[PDB]
Amino acid sequence: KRGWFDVVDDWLRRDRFVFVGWSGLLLFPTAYLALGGWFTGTTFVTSWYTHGLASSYLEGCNFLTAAVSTPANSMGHSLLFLWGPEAQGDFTRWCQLGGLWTFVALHGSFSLIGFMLRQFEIARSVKIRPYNAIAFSAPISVFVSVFLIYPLGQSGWFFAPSFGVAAIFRFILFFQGFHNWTLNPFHMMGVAGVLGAALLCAIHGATVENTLFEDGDGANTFRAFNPTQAEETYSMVTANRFWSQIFGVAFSNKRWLHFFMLFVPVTGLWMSAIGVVGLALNLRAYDFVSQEIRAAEDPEFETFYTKNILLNEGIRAWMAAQDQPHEKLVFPEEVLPRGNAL
Amino acid sequence: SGATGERPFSDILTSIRYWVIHSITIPSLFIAGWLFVSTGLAYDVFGSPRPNEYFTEDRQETPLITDRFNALEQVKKLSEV
Amino acid sequence: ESTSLWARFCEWVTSTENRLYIGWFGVLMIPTLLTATSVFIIAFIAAPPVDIDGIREPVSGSLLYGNNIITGAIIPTSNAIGLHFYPIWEAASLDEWLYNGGPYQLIVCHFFLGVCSYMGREWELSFRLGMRPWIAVAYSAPVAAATAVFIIYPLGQGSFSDGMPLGISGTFNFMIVFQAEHNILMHPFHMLGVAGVFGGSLFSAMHGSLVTSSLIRETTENESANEGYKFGQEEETYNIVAAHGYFGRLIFQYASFNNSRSLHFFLAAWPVVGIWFTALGISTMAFNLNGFNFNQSVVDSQGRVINTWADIINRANLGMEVMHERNAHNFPLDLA
Amino acid sequence: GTTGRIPLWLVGTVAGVAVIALVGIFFYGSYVGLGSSL
Amino acid sequence: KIDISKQGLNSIQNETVKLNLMGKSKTMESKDWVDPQGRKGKGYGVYRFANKYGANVDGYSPIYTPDTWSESGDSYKLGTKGLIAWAGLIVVLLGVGINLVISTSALG
Amino acid sequence: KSYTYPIFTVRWLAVHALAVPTVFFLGAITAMQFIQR
Amino acid sequence: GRDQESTGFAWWAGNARLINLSGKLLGAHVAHAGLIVFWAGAMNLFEVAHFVPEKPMYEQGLILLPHLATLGYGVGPGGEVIDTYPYFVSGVLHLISSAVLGFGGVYHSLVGPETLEESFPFFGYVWKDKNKMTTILGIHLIVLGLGAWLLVWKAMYFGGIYDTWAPGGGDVRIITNPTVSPGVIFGYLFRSPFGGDGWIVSVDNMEDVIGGHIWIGTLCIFGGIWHILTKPWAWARRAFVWSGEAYLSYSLGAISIMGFTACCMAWFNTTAYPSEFYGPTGPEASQSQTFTFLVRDQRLGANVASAQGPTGLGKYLMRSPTGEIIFGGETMRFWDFRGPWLEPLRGPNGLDLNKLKNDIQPWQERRAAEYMTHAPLGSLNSVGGVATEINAVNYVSPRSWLATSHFCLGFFFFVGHLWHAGRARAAAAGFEKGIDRDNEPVLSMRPL
Numbered sequence A: 001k002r003g004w005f006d007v008v009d010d011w012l013r014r015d016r017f018v019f020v021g022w023s024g025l026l027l028f029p030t031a032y033l034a035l036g037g038w039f040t041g042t043t044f045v046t047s048w049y050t051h052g053l054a055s056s057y058l059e060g061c062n063f064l065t066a067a068v069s070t071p072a073n074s075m076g077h078s079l080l081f082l083w084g085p086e087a088q089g090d091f092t093r094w095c096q097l098g099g100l101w102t103f104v105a106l107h108g109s110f111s112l113i114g115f116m117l118r119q120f121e122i123a124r125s126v127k128i129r130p131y132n133a134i135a136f137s138a139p140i141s142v143f144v145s146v147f148l149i150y151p152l153g154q155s156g157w158f159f160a161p162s163f164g165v166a167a168i169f170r171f172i173l174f175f176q177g178f179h180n181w182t183l184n185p186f187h188m189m190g191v192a193g194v195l196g197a198a199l200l201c202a203i204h205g206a207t208v209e210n211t212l213f214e215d216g217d218g219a220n221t222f223r224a225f226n227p228t229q230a231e232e233t234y235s236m237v238t239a240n241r242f243w244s245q246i247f248g249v250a251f252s253n254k255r256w257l258h259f260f261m262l263f264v265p266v267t268g269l270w271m272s273a274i275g276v277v278g279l280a281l282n283l284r285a286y287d288f289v290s291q292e293i294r295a296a297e298d299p300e301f302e303t304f305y306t307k308n309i310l311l312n313e314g315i316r317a318w319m320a321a322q323d324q325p326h327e328k329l330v331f332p333e334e335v336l337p338r339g340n341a342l
Numbered sequence B: 001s002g003a004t005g006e007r008p009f010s011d012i013l014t015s016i017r018y019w020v021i022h023s024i025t026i027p028s029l030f031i032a033g034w035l036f037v038s039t040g041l042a043y044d045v046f047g048s049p050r051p052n053e054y055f056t057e058d059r060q061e062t063p064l065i066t067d068r069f070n071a072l073e074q075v076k077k078l079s080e081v
Numbered sequence C: 001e002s003t004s005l006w007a008r009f010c011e012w013v014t015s016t017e018n019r020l021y022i023g024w025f026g027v028l029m030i031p032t033l034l035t036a037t038s039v040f041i042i043a044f045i046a047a048p049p050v051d052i053d054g055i056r057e058p059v060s061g062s063l064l065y066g067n068n069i070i071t072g073a074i075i076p077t078s079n080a081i082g083l084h085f086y087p088i089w090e091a092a093s094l095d096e097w098l099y100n101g102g103p104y105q106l107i108v109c110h111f112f113l114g115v116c117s118y119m120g121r122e123w124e125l126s127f128r129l130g131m132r133p134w135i136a137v138a139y140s141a142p143v144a145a146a147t148a149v150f151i152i153y154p155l156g157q158g159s160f161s162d163g164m165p166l167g168i169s170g171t172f173n174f175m176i177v178f179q180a181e182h183n184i185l186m187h188p189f190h191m192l193g194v195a196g197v198f199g200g201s202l203f204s205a206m207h208g209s210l211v212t213s214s215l216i217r218e219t220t221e222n223e224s225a226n227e228g229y230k231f232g233q234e235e236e237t238y239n240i241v242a243a244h245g246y247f248g249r250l251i252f253q254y255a256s257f258n259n260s261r262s263l264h265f266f267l268a269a270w271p272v273v274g275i276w277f278t279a280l281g282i283s284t285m286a287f288n289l290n291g292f293n294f295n296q297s298v299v300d301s302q303g304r305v306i307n308t309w310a311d312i313i314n315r316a317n318l319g320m321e322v323m324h325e326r327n328a329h330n331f332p333l334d335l336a
Numbered sequence D: 001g002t003t004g005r006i007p008l009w010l011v012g013t014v015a016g017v018a019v020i021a022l023v024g025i026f027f028y029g030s031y032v033g034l035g036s037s038l
Numbered sequence E: 001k002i003d004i005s006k007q008g009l010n011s012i013q014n015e016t017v018k019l020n021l022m023g024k025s026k027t028m029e030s031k032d033w034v035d036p037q038g039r040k041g042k043g044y045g046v047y048r049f050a051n052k053y054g055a056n057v058d059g060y061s062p063i064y065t066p067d068t069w070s071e072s073g074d075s076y077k078l079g080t081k082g083l084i085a086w087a088g089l090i091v092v093l094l095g096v097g098i099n100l101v102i103s104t105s106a107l108g
Numbered sequence F: 001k002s003y004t005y006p007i008f009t010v011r012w013l014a015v016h017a018l019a020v021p022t023v024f025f026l027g028a029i030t031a032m033q034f035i036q037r
Numbered sequence G: 001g002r003d004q005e006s007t008g009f010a011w012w013a014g015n016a017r018l019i020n021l022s023g024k025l026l027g028a029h030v031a032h033a034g035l036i037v038f039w040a041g042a043m044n045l046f047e048v049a050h051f052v053p054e055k056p057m058y059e060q061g062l063i064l065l066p067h068l069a070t071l072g073y074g075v076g077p078g079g080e081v082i083d084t085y086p087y088f089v090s091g092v093l094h095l096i097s098s099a100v101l102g103f104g105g106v107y108h109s110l111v112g113p114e115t116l117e118e119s120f121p122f123f124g125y126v127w128k129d130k131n132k133m134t135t136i137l138g139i140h141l142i143v144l145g146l147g148a149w150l151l152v153w154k155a156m157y158f159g160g161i162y163d164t165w166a167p168g169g170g171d172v173r174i175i176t177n178p179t180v181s182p183g184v185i186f187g188y189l190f191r192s193p194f195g196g197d198g199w200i201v202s203v204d205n206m207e208d209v210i211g212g213h214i215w216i217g218t219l220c221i222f223g224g225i226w227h228i229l230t231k232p233w234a235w236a237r238r239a240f241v242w243s244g245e246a247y248l249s250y251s252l253g254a255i256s257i258m259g260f261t262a263c264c265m266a267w268f269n270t271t272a273y274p275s276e277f278y279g280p281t282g283p284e285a286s287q288s289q290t291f292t293f294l295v296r297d298q299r300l301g302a303n304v305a306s307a308q309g310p311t312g313l314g315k316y317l318m319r320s321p322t323g324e325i326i327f328g329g330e331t332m333r334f335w336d337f338r339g340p341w342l343e344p345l346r347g348p349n350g351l352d353l354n355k356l357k358n359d360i361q362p363w364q365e366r367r368a369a370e371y372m373t374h375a376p377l378g379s380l381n382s383v384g385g386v387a388t389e390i391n392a393v394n395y396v397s398p399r400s401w402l403a404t405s406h407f408c409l410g411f412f413f414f415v416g417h418l419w420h421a422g423r424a425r426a427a428a429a430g431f432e433k434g435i436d437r438d439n440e441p442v443l444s445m446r447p448l
Ligand code: CLA
Pocket: A025, A026, A029, A030, A033, A079, A080, A081, A082, A083, A099, A102, A103, A104, A106, A107, A110
């Protein structure tokens, strides 16, 4: 006698092998298409007419160099639907126009929403706190700023990161040469977050494993544990005294330690996301003007910053001709900045 | 612990029926993938150039899409063999 | 009880009642790390410019010489020195020692001994406290990475000038030149290193969020949840079964660690193994075993080379190669 | 009918060999044909 | 507490595999047992808090429980009739598959 | 004592939603290894 | 075998179940020995089969044949391979010997005695028996000394060793006057590892190489007899952990050092690793480039001594910070490189200007030209040249493979010391399985 919502809710939230839930209605369709779009694009779809490159296994690329490349810059920020004014219903021409990138980017962005809603959905059902969903906001902020916000501030989707291994590497090296992204204080906070989180993961895992209580007679200490055991498996007091005498400071609160393990990585990605938002507008921390004034006036003042500035000039000049074919940059070799010999 | 009502994978992957059924289904999907490429259908469906189709007598350089609302017409001319 | 001087000294050295444990590795760690710390702080603030490339073109790296915190650095030893030992007593004057990049070798040599002794000091305290001795093994991963960029890479390249500068902007110059000469991004070991830190960052966030999500209610809402834990508790402060239930439904039941001991070993192994390989990657690239080179790998039927994303990377690599050390190369090949 | 079960370790072994064979073919194709620079 | 008899491991053919999947070792429970490295046990088994909780993590959540397997999976229902048809179908499809691969290729 | 399980379930669709296309794609990529420029 | 039920070690630590099973542990070590001899034989035959005489050894990815060539097998003057039959019998002899070694490994592992202490007291041992452990150490120390004497017998009585510094060109040479002076030997051992010194990697004569192996052969034999007739003293008994895993960790730390040294030997040394077979070193190739351009620019007409670079330093010739005349450019770092093709142009004060512009032999130019193009630079997929190069040349130097691999092995076996030595102390102390819940040591300490 239950209504549609109740009868459907019963089926969606059934405790099966792979939980579906209400958010699965949004996650699984979009996530499958984003996965399928990437695998299809890296296997058969070319980037010959968008970037002048081969980016599929069928064209001869391998896992490292295959990618689902962005549309041509002339497309601007066109959403590039299968039915849009570009590639009007023609599937094969849609693939040749780079429309598969916006397909993966859009259905992929809604999959991230669906997965984060899934974390809320399951946590409410299991009756626990929603801190895993809050932790997942950081990867979403990275995806939203890097794959959506940054190209939207630039000329078009062409400058978004293409979905591939080497394509991401080109995107990375583009940011050094054109944005000096290493010098940005927001990637610096992002690096500290990621490196700090990797440190915490390793240091906490090792500390627990080396302060374990003897709860068995076997050398294999993995078996001497029960998920329902009330006693702690490792000595926090020994762990605390160890790091107090080795490092000078140690965690004394188990709850604080695990929250810190969550705060460092999330805060890092969020800070890094702010910096990429700034690069979307070319609002970059490219240079220190005081040193540039000093260097120009004094031809003997050199720092590692000025050396990097010259490296960026080399990256921009030797990469623009092929990385930006829409600009039609024909640079004669004499005009390219080149050092002695080499 | 417990189980969610599905048959244990170990049971299915050890049963004779599964291998009798998947000794044809999995091989057939592989062969279909092989024929999808060998018959040239992969090139035609997704439009990737054949190894002898990247350049033409008219165009000896990389293509460039320089139009948005006429991109469908333009990419046909660039892809013309 | 002990009456002998050495018997009393050895008891004090290995005493676990010291605020900071000293131990026998500490009689090596403390003097070396203090020596490196002292010269580093002094050099980072007031060191004169250093002729890093051996071409009589000094590079300023000190705060009092026009750098800020980001651009300040301890410049590596001169290329004229090479791998030759350059202690302060092998220089005619302390001005000459500063000019040739002496402080870099003093820091790097004492610092390498410090981290090796810091690693042993971690083992020693564990033995004195009666715990399992493998925190030092997990610390070998960052030690290997530090040893690779300060010792092994200069060793293979033939000069301490190719070590990582002790500065922020100096680090970036190290990475950019490293990409241009070795294509480190295409090397499978930096790939494993990236998976080590991206995965380690992921696992830290997941483990931290899963434990925080499962905290057993022991406080009110006007107090920090941390207050629910008392240092020295014999009972568990969060429900492991509840956290496993959540993550079990999140992907599927058998993708989750039901065992806290297995989970924490995985939390330690994944980043440590990843950093071990990226440390090896720099060490292997020290002997010029570069990353994958897929330039002009795709050619059409008539032989025309079809570019890929790897070729676009080569274009960026080309730009850095022809600009790093502009005045240092007299001959076309960068064999050094 | 025919009573019996395929041993799990045999399933893993044959599947493991097939995966290794598939990877080997991919590495073989890395040196020949398209994408081989030849 | 947990009952090991209702964990689905009761039909393991090998006793050692049955004990390993149960997280139990009668050998290690004896106080005269000696490690391969020469260390004598302290009287605990694989897990000291077992009995208090009923079992270790191995017995708490096994991943290989043949008791819960379907009995219909122990045998192929079609029997020799199906296998012969399966064997014949394999040969026919193998020949067609090879011919299709050969025909649709630049070979020869 | 006796266990009878359903053959087709949500898990079945998930396994085949990913396995079927993968085996096809694996067959296609294997065919590409023998294509000559 | 055993199981986790009766041992407490899982399958992934399964070989730890052999710690006190001396008989099975013997078969384990003999079987791995058969694998080592098998690989040496199989890889030798693989390299002989894939050997084409139109290329040098270092251009064919051979790492075992150069080791045979340095011993003076099938090589004529100038590092030219004349016959590969000696390389063939080396591979066959190892391959066949691995079969009997493999049989003993399989026999002593599967069906031989589990413990030798009862039936064979001579071979039986318990790790705690320091006396018995030293005898085994002493015995295997003698066979190592005898193995070292084989090298000097080869270099002095059986054909000889390939000398790359031999007068008249590199050739197989009988060593008649090995350098056994204590000052020379101790000079190499306690030399600095830094530039110019290079510790023992800087040995530059076959007289010093086989002079050292005379010392090593003699010391190991005397040390073998010493460690057989004596038991460890009190100072040693209170300094080392006397457990089977502890002895393993000592060896792991030792061969970690040996792994690193082999990495630096293959990378810098040109005597024990002649460039004729292993290719140019890193310093050699960089030194060969400036030598090549010095020679070709002289013919075009230019005073190389007076030529300035953009920086004002000598474009071709400059002075090292110690005063020696050296090649200019970035290769100023490699000024301590010494090679057979370059020493004839070097006088007491450094490179001789007169000889550089009057008496450069064609063979010296050809050597430097060849070494420059085969510089030890390459990619993971063996693409020769710098990272910014096209897929044209399929070459990675054997020095790159030898140095890169044996550094990774050297580092991982250092982690072996850290792991197996930490566990050895904890297990002996008795807390390798965890902290006693009722007897936690920290709980009995004053708070900080
Ligand atoms: C829940 C699953 C889901 C979701 C969220 C999306 C979402 C999206 N898809 Mg996708 N898609 C899906 C499933 C899904 N898809 C499936 C199952 C398939 C078949 C395999 C596809 C195949 C597909 C293709 C081929 C394409 C997309 C595209 C898109 C993007 C824009 C298309 C769009 O929404 O325009 C339309 C907007 C709406 C329909 C708003 C809906 C609001 C409701 C339904 C209105 C109710 C209508 C009703 C008659 C009332 C009348 C109102 C009156 C005023 C007229 C978008 C982000 C395009 C793309 O990738 O961009 C590059 C594209 O080309 N999808």
